């Protein structure tokens, strides 16, 4: 009954039929994106209308279309033709990946480059990568993929151990022609294998680990109703799934006594970009927008009990559309469980003689995606004390290159002749805030140092200051770890019992933001990644920090365009966009498969409650 | 057998007998500190010589002494008389804390102050706090405690809810004299109780939490031998305990194939300071050196199975001396256990068809201490992948004051009329490094941004730079989160298979350092806290960043005096001192008992290994 329920296989089947009957899904057509639309702002909206947004690609070269359909009523609501030279190309299709390697295998320049290196074309894998926008005027309005080559010595070999440096090709995947083959010179192909399941590399496996058994003899403490509505330890929320963003959290609220108090209306990772910092022309164009260009939800893993998710696990199995409109289930794609989290609060009081200890726990909602060589885990945590936390876990196989003789300022050496270019992994969290309702504002809080003198005779005082962000043009903020900078989202119309506005404080990790030169193509296309915090006024169509069509868009779409409207954000319906990322200088220990590294952020209550919200937790 | 074994009850009794026989421990003497000395540099040598360092107080006012004893040989090695007006007072004795409230209850100035506030002296608790060094000349060479008052309405009442503001007293605890009583005016005593076990405050306890059962059916994966030597998942170390520093880790090493490779010779929290930022004269002197002044190991809790430590727990019960030289056991004062830690590495490869997932684990060594209102947990973690991490957990009851009617720039309001002064909790980790042996160096690593132009035509390149710290005068460093600054400890004489020096990278949290004015008493006494990183050349007697005798000691000792020697630290036996801390602006949710907040640091291998060190972890 809930408007926020997961899409059904039946709903996707109905969408396919509606498109077919309307003549919009012929054999030349491919679905590049399909997702359910959130309800519009409407406090009391009772007329159920499930609407789906669809991007339709044409493999014969005709213009693509953006279509909105109503599954409840069985109608096409709107359909507009897209001019991709203006507004960007559609996301990359899974079936276009294979086309790159196939096309190059018959191209005479590619074959001659391989022949010079004595490489058998049947053993050469091509990574099909997004193109971006650079100097090639012939690419405007065409769907281009770029390919980099790796050698697979046998079918189970890790091709990432054998990059073929000095060689790159550009491919038009619609007209199926190879537009350029660039060969800058012969580099030795690294010869060591990177097969992390080969006993000759692992050695004998350890026999020293004894089992850790985590069970819940009475079952978990959370309930799941209506498919995806969660109730756990005073928290209430809906777990959504979108093929572009992955797991999305809706209607995060906390039951404070008798009232359900809203906190966040919608939480998602709305973009993630992986820019590479190697100036070689073989790779200097390389920037993955894993969310915007590839769609991270469509590559979600099926998660295995006891290996990926340990404990008493409740799974969700989201349904997405394939390229022809058929429903596809991602079995066990989302893990949900609770975890012990150590001590919550503890005090042994000499004067009262009371000894008090309580334990903490967290609710975990997670999924894992694989995009080529990289694998990313997305984890949302809810804690007993009101804290909300997100954590990204990065693993997989690092992207490789040759390691040049004489060294490099932009590439790490992992093995003899084997390099790994410097890169970043930068995420954008979109937090549609609803702190006790929709009238919210953001304050920037800095520590204030005070000088020794009158009123501070011993020179010990320090303080803090808060600055209200009142318009969008002043709501593009940078971190300052030295001054302990945080941001507070408050509701000026809802006060706690001390007559202070209720709030939540965002604690950032204060990692470096985008390092590229401000005049670069990537700085224009991923402008969100150049600043730590953005605040916008809510609008239905301002969904992604990079715009709707990221692939081969020339730049400026998304947050810079939104912010330019300079709207009032002082006690309004607002959206917080937080940039956070990992700067990765690969180390030898990252090879041949990388141990997890993590980055994230958290939000903590700041005068939201009238006292600690965990006084009613029992001892057990 | 091992020189690093925990002190035994017999050893402590033998120290007592040796001191008594030598005429050093008559009835007027008290042991203020007793601890075992680490072996001097030179592996073996002594065959067996257990030495103890003792600080001996005299309650008649005679000069105290520092004494070193050999328990093996039954001899006093050295005994020196201390001039405390020069080099500092001994740590506070537990029996001196009691003296303060008793003395004040008979002082006519204190009684008149309580009478002015209609308070019953029998219900007034006095927090006895370290005095520091300020403008009171009569305190030089005397042992002083300062007292702040709180009302306890009944024996089980939380007195922290009822501060008596405007009143402070200073007490000479040796001559038993109240030196000064300062009354700046009557403030209302906040009337609301803070009794977090009172059902009228907690409401009905939750019935929603289902059990989480963590068990190890085959027992734990680590072994304990010789009482305190641990072997776990290729790690090797000895767990020490010192009454001042608490848990100390010795001889941290990693078994890499057939070689035991040292990493850290000794790791400890060597000081921790809690400075308050309220400029009121009632509290502007308030600074706790919990390690140096109070001795945190002395106040270690007994940890209860299933509440404080959950899972298959192995306990250590360290032995300390009481004030008369009798052994006292802290039953179950150290918990050790291993914990599941999520995914270690994961990759699903399209080209090879191999799906690979491995799980991570960590070894946890922890203890908890209680000093008045505050409770601190100290956690050391060892991970499968070579990471070492420390985490401090702060909880307990926040220190309170009145909340002034006009508001305050330096105090938070927690409840009607009840304030909590701003403060910090700052730690100093002393890491006696031994990366593949004792020839080590520290490099500072910053990200380097590059300008678009020749050799970087697309403006995407970025790099890093490393700066070797060659002399102590240049090894006092600040964080810079914006440039991703880390520090690498390497061994220039031990190279990995790529012919690069092996190393470990220190990752800081980049939280603010000491905020007090640089001219203040606290800035001089806690100079270590003003900078994030210090490197010194190892010396036997350079143990604490604040020096040996912190109580009522002015500046002049500790890290600033050590680094003036300007010793060579480029490929030498070096010690890293890392400052990290929490800046606490108390929130309403911190009342009436504070949920845990955390801070820490971690060290990760950086080319220490020749490839990932966890390729031999099994699937399970
Ligand atoms: Cu990476
Ligand atoms: Cu605090
Ligand atoms: Na909002
Ligand atoms: Na050392």
Curated annotation (Swiss-Prot), chains A, B:
Binding site for Cu cation: 423, 425, 584
Record has Oxidoreductase as a keyword: yes
Domain of life assignment: Bacteria
Pfam families hit by this protein: AGAO-like_N2, Cu_amine_oxid
A molecular function (GO) term: copper ion binding
Catalytic activity: a primary methyl amine + O2 + H2O = an aldehyde + H2O2 + NH4(+); 2-phenylethylamine + O2 + H2O = 2-phenylacetaldehyde + H2O2 + NH4(+)
Subunit structure: Homodimer.
Name recorded for this polypeptide: Phenylethylamine oxidase
Keywords: Copper, Disulfide bond, Metal-binding, Oxidoreductase, TPQ
Enzyme kind, highest EC tier: oxidoreductase
PTM text: Topaquinone (TPQ) is generated by copper-dependent autoxidation of a specific tyrosyl residue.
Induction: By phenethylamine.
Listed GO biological process terms: amine metabolic process
Family membership noted in the UniProt record: Belongs to the copper/topaquinone oxidase family.
Biological role: Catalyzes the oxidative deamination of phenylethylamine to phenylacetaldehyde with the concomitant production of hydrogen peroxide and ammonia.
Binding residue positions for substrate: 288-299, 371-376
List of catalytic residues: 290, 374
Cofactor note: Binds 1 copper ion per subunit. Contains 1 topaquinone per subunit.
Protein species of origin: Arthrobacter globiformis
Lineage: Bacteria, Bacillati, Actinomycetota, Actinomycetes, Micrococcales
Modified residues (2',4',5'-topaquinone): 374
EC numbers on record: 1.4.3.21
């Amino acid at each position: 009954a809930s408007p926020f329920r997961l899409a059904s296989a039946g709903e996707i089947s109905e969408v396919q039929g509606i498109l077919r009957t309307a003549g919009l899904l012929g054999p030349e057509k491919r679905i590049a994106y399909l997702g359910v639309l959130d309800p519009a702002r409407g406090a009391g909206s009772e007329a159920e209308d499930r609407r789906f947004r669809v991007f339709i690609h044409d493999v014969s070269g005709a213009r693509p279309q953006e279509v909105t359909v109503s599954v409840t009523n069985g109608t096409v609501i709107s359909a507009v033709e897209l001019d991709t030279a203006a507004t960007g190309e559609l996301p990359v299709l899974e079936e276009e990946f294979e086309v790159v390697e196939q096309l190059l295998a018959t191209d005479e320049r590619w074959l001659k480059a391989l022949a010079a290196r004595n490489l058998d074309v049947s053993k050469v894998r091509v990574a099909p990568l997004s193109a971006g926008v650079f100097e090639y005027a012939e690419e405007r309005g065409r769907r281009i993929l770029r390919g980099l080559a790796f050698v697979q010595d046998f079918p189970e070999d890790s091709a990432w151990a054998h990059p073929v440096d000095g060689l790159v090709a550009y491919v038009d995947v619609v007209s199926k022609e190879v537009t350029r083959v660039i060969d800058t010179g012969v580099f030795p192909v690294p010869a060591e294998h990177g097969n992390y399941t080969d006993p000759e590399l692992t050695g004998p496996l350890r026999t020293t680990q004894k089992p850790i058994s985590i069970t819940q003899p009475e079952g978990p403490s959370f309930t799941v109703t209506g498919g995806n509505h969660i109730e756990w330890e005073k928290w209430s929320l809906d777990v959504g799934f979108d093929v572009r963003e992955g797991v999305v959290l809706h209607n995060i609220a906390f039951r404070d006594g008798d009232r359900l108090r809203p906190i966040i209306n919608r939480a998602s990772i709305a973009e993630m970009v992986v820019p590479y910092g190697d100036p070689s022309p073989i790779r200097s164009w390389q920037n993955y927008f894993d969310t915007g260009e590839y769609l991270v939800g469509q590559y979600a893993n099926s998660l295995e009990l006891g290996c990926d998710c340990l404990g008493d696990i409740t799974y969700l199995s989201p349904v997405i559309s394939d390229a022809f409109g058929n429903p596809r289930e991602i079995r066990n794609g989302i893990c949900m469980h609770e975890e012990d989290w150590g001590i919550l609060a503890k005090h042994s009081d000499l004067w009262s003689g009371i000894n008090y200890t309580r334990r903490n726990r967290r609710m975990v909602i997670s999924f894992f995606t694989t995009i080529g060589n990289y694998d990313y885990g997305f984890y949302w945590y809810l804690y007993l004390d009101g804290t909300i936390e997100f954590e990204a876990k990065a693993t997989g196989v690092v992207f490789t290159s040759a390691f040049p003789e004489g060294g490099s300022d932009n590439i790490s050496q992992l093995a003899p002749g084997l390099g790994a270019p410097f890169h970043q992994h930068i995420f954008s969290a979109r937090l549609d805030m609803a702190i006790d309702g929709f009238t919210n504002r953001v304050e920037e809080e800095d520590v204030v140092r005070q000088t020794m003198g009158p009123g501070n005779e011993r020179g010990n005082a320090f303080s803090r200051k808060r600055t209200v962000l009142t318009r969008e043009s002043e709501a593009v903020r940078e971190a300052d770890a030295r001054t302990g900078r945080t941001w507070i989202i408050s509701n000026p119309e809802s006060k706690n019992r001390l007559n202070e506005p209720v709030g939540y404080k965002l604690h950032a990790h204060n990692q470096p933001t985008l390092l590229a030169d401000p005049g670069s193509s990537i700085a224009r296309r991923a402008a969100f990644a150049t600043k730590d915090l953005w605040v916008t006024r809510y609008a239905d169509d301002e969904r992604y920090p990079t715009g709707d069509f990221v692939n081969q868009h020339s730049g400026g779409a998304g947050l810079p365009s939104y912010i330019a409207q300079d709207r009032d954000i002082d006690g309004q319906d607002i959206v917080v966009w937080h940039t956070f990322g990992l700067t990765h200088f690969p180390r030898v220990e990252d090879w041949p498969i990388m141990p997890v590294d993590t980055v994230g952020f958290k939000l903590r209550p700041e005068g939201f409650f009238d006292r600690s919200p965990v006084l009613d937790v029992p001892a057990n």
